[PDB]
Amino acid sequence: MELWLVRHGETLWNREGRLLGWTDLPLTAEGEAQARRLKGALPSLPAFSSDLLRARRTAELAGFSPRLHPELREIHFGALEGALWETLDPRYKEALLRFQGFHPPGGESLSAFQERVFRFLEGLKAPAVLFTHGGVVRAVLRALGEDGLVPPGSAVAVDWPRRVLVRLALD
Secondary structure: OEEEEEEOOOOHHHHHOEOOOOOOOOOOHHHHHHHHHHOOOOOOOOEEEOOOHHHHHHHHHOOOOOEEOHHHOOOOOHHHOOOEOOOOOHHHHHHHHOOOOOOOOOOOOHHHHHHHHHHHHHOOOOOEEEEEOHHHHHHHHHHOOOOOOOOOOOEEEEEOOOEEEEEEOOO
8 A cells, every 4th residue: 555654844852852752842944844845745645644733734834634643643752752862771772773662651662652553554545645753654664674764854655564665855
């Protein structure tokens, strides 16, 4: 199934390097610029979006009127929301780098996050554009044998659940 996953534009915590999950930050001026650039670079397909502000705003600026789904939200970091990556305990850093065995207090485990994301994707019966988050895109890429956290305001098209089709980044 052809699915286009879009990572929302940048927020302040992108440059600050803080874990950004359910904290509802708005896009920065540049983030909105990145979103605008997506308009015309994404196919006209039904759209779904994380209900978090930065994702919804990215979808709007990209020219879409998506159906909101909490299932497309970034992982919930719990007590780690807002934590600087730099000073994150090595055990948490490794869990996030290896994408396994991560369950922050008051948050969501990586395995539960994956279950949530993949269950949502399984329900998509036709091609669509999904406005979402870095962790969601990473979960999909990693499950397809590819690594890397695509830049803010960029997109990746995949043939779910078989392979990545194209990675699209604009300047």
